[PDB]
Amino acid sequence: VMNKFEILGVVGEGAYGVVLKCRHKETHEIVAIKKFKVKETTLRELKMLRTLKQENIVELKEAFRRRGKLYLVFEYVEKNMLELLEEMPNGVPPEKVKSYIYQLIKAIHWCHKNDIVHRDIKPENLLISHNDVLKLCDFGFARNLSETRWYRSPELLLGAPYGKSVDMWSVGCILGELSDGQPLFPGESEIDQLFTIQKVLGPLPSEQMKLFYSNPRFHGLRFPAVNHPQSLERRYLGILNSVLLDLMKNLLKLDPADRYLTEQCLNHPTFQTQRL
Ligand SMILES: N#CCc1ccc(Nc2nccc(Nc3cc(C4CCCC4)n[nH]3)n2)cc1
Ligand code: NA
């Protein structure tokens, strides 16, 4: 309990709840304890965490209860990518961009090999250790395939069926943001998110446009048609080199069927080239 764990400070508080940085009084291990302000989502996530146990996935260590309140004890990692971008608001060095995107793709590759899509990859849930080791967490929106809006693919925004390609979109968004510090698609609403995406990449594919009208969620709403699209080439000139730009264009294909999945990404020149 807080019998056994000393509270060192507050890591975060939000919609997720509250995460405390704590220390075991007997062993002196430092941990992250998530306290809740039990639901199906929690049980689903714990199952996935066990399946995915690995050095690039946050470890759940134990669960306990104090007077009916659930506490989950995790591995503690010193920071997340969101905090890192606050410290470096104009982006990180190109070497660190490649290392974090490599590691993210490797972690997603492991999820996908286990038939799990994460569906909510964003800087806030990418933990980065003192040794620069990236780890994934926050599996509450994840799905097993056999059964805030800024990083979501257009097909997920529209309510379409989805597969492994959903996570590759998020990778492309993070590649850009690590390079210049700026969120690539900062929409203000679901509709404005679709607008912001097309403002860069041009009109959505035919099937997605049809989904806007067949999905009753958008009944009577105005489709956000784009005027003069900008292009990734224009958006990232002087930010991305041609090799990273090439990779980014193939992560951010509007049609999920055209996106590179993880194995193809790892065969890309971005990761296969060796500094001389
Ligand atoms: N819940 C959730 C997602 C989330 C992820 C990160 C943060 N913020 C943050 N900010 C700085 C460090 C940090 N370290 C950390 C978090 C965890 C857990 C994953 C699971 C809950 C403890 N272990 N080590 N987390 C806040 C929320
Ligand atoms: Na750490």
Residue numbers in the entry: 9 to 45, 53 to 162, 174 to 302
Reproduce text from the manuscript describing this model:
CDKL family proteins contain a conserved N-terminal kinase domain and variable C termini. The kinase domains of CDKL1, CDKL2, CDKL3, and CDKL5 were crystallized using a phosphomimetic Asp-X-Glu (DXE) substitution and in the presence of identified inhibitors.
By contrast, the CDKL1, CDKL3, and CDKL5 structures displayed characteristics of active kinases. Its nitrile H bonded with the catalytic lysines of CDKL3 and CDKL5. Catalytic site interactions may help support the active conformation of these kinases.
